[model samples]
Target: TELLKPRTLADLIRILHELFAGDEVNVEEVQAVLEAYESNPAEWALYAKFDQYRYTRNLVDQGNGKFNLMILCWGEGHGSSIHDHTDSHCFLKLLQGNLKETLFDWPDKKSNEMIKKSERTLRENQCAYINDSIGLHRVENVSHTEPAVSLHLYSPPFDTCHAFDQRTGHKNKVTMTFHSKFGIRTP
Candidate 1:
């Protein structure tokens, strides 16, 4: 399904709702919505910076937690801990640089043994999405000198996630946080 590309970041903020009006918000559906914005990626000069650390900044949260729009700043070679997004759906759009995402299989949800499934290298203007069953992933900036910037959308906004420590094979839950909102640090 092809949708009109968003003309501005403001348009990118709410266009996903159109996708939700359909039967299922699968990967294909999300990609189309993301492309709506990526197709005309201008006027987004403010939300693309990385300030010494990896962080996520929430842009908008729909009523009743229908969905959330966030900007991710991945620090140099900064990869996230492998995690289950609390079964929430995810849509990612690469705005700058490259992001290497590795998806893993759940050999057993209870076991610490996760299997490598596939990898995706996303460059500028690329968009992808995943549902709950296939959503487990770990992403890194993969750049030594430059930081990677990405736009992320989560349906029904997740508050907690199950994550693994790559070194110790330990499993734990992580509480999500926002580094800022509307370009200002959150206090």
Candidate 2:
């Protein structure tokens, strides 16, 4: 029932090594990391319960810029608006529950229009690697009853992100602000 002993900071580092070793991102490496995680579902389940509002763990200044690891807890009906990373790469690993990820592709940046490319259900131990090349997308908790949890890794430390309002096609750039302590609060 207890997932692999609590994952140590060392374990997370190892996972990061495998994920960033290749010049170009490869799905196989990401899958391998997920496989390692599947081997210890209990530990993952427990990790899913840690303080969701706080920054659990992260690493910065990896030459490519800072990379952060965050655990997000989504209650029923919770979801992220359509957004893009714009010059950054993100890796999302689903640790507990399920998420419906919708990916979009824009034909031209000037148009500001995007086409729905794909949608996938990410379950436990699975991960999705996204970068500026393919970073426009939205995620949601489809389940009406249970909450969902996921780990997000952002390269270049995500100092700022552009959020899009799908309904009006308006875009807003927001600064990335984290509290000195755990949990984020308005400045």
Candidate 3:
């Protein structure tokens, strides 16, 4: 097998650029990209680590605001709130440990009501994807002894995303934050 390995953010972005050259990409197409990179871990050495607080680190921010890569760290029991990507497409891969993802569906397109749809757990080297067209979801590190790390790629970047509130039927657009650029942790 003669396959070129992905070493940097540009390498992965090129694959995406090529895949979506003439058409819009869907979850399936993006997941295939996730699977391709899940086969190797060398490209993630710089952005892997866990802290008491779960956070996302920026790996690459496409200059034109077309896309970006992020590495999200989850300490034990840490999970993200259910949220939407501001209609952006998302591609994700679980790089280390295990994660539980719960997907939700909106009862009415005009409201923020969410219904629990399904749940599944992903282990290391596993990949999945979702777009704004898909329903909403949240992810957590279910491990009692270890932390979790995952990679996310979002295209047609948004300044913020809307998070859902189950009790109040509310959704709010929240700004995106990063630990630092390039997944770097400053002293």
TM-scores, each model vs. reference = 0.83, 0.68, 0.81
Stretches of model 3 off by over 4 angstroms after superposition? 1-13, 20-23, 39-42, 61-64, 107-113
CA lDDT of each prediction against the hidden true structure: 0.70, 0.60, 0.71
* Clash pairs, model 1 backbone: 6-36
**What number of backbone clashes does candidate 2 have, counting pairs of residues 3 or more apart or in separate chains?**
2
Give the number of the best model, judged by TM-score. 1
Report the lDDT tens digits of candidate 3 across residue range 18-60: 6555536565756766666643556666676556766555564
- Point out where model 2 deviates above 4 Å: 1-10, 15-31, 39-65, 107-115, 177-187
Instruction: Give Cα distance to truth, residue 141, candidate 3, Å.
Output: 1.0
Better of 1 and 2 by lDDT: 1
lDDT of 1 by residue, 1-187 (tens): 3566777777655566666655455667567767656534355555554567555555644523567777788888787878777767777888777898898765454546566689989888788776558756788888899777788888767778878765444678888877777666675
Worst 10 residues of 2 by lDDT: 54-63
Q: Evaluated with lDDT, which candidate comes out highest?
A: 3
Better of 2 and 3 by lDDT: 3
Candidate 2 vs. true structure, TM-score: 0.68
lDDT score, candidate 2: 0.60
